[PDB]
Amino acid sequence: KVIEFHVVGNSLNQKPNKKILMWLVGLQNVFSHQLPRMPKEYITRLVFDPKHKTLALIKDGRVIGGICFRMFPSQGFTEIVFCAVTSNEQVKGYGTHLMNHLKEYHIKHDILNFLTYADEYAIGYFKKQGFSKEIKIPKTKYVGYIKDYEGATLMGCELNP
Ligand SMILES: CC(C)(COP(=O)(O)OP(=O)(O)OC[C@H]1O[C@@H](n2cnc3c(N)ncnc32)[C@H](O)[C@@H]1OP(=O)(O)O)[C@@H](O)C(=O)NCCC(=O)NCCS
């Protein structure tokens, strides 16, 4: 019925809010069920990590999808950690809106590069979102504090104006 996008996080500043707190758990839940190769404890570890933020897709007050990301302003890129939409809401374009919305959010902050390690079943999604295996960014800029998930295919995406 009603759709909303909210960028949330556990920032050590001021976010112990109950509304966003329940959303973070809802995000952990959806990520955990949709991303089996990511242990649930690990997902909880990063989703609540102050350096990470998550773009949440809320529908009728409940989280049905989101994208956890870790921005690296200095190195001019953002790491896309988790992406998922609940099973019952998939194949409706929401995954598309999320990536699109997240792109604009980054063009706004002057970050025009997306780097992620796509999983076997993810490759198709990122491809349809404009990501490509051919990295348009030097390794010296990302290879360092960007987790390289075993069995994953490193992919990138450069944003528009
Ligand atoms: C990948 C995911 C987040 C997005 O799914 P979604 O909300 O259903 O995506 P969309 O409906 O916006 O996809 C639309 C387009 O993506 C394509 N696509 C490719 N891979 C896809 C996949 N795994 N699921 C759904 N669509 C997919 C569709 O064919 C479609 O092409 P079209 O617009 O020309 O018809 C969701 O399928 C999911 O939760 N997957 C399980 C976890 C996962 O594999 N995550 C990868 C990290 S994002």
The CATH class, in words, for 1-161 is: alpha beta
Q: Name the resolution in angstroms.
A: 2.3
Q: Distance between CA 30 and CA 19 in Å, rounded?
A: 17
Q: Distance between CA 137 and CA 157 in Å, rounded?
A: 9
Asked whether the beta carbons of 23 and 68 are under 8 A apart, the reply is no
Q: What residues does each domain of the chain span?
A: 1-161
What method was applied to determine this entry?
A: X-ray
Asked whether the beta carbons of 84 and 94 are under 8 A apart, the reply is no
Best residue among 125, 153, 154, 157 to mutate for probing ligand 1, ranked by most atoms within 8 Å of CB: 125
DSSP β-bridge partners for residue 33? none
Supply the residues annotated as catalytic.
Answer: 79
Q: Distance between CA 11 and CA 147 in Å, rounded?
A: 20
Protein residue closest via CA to atom 41 of ligand 1 = 34
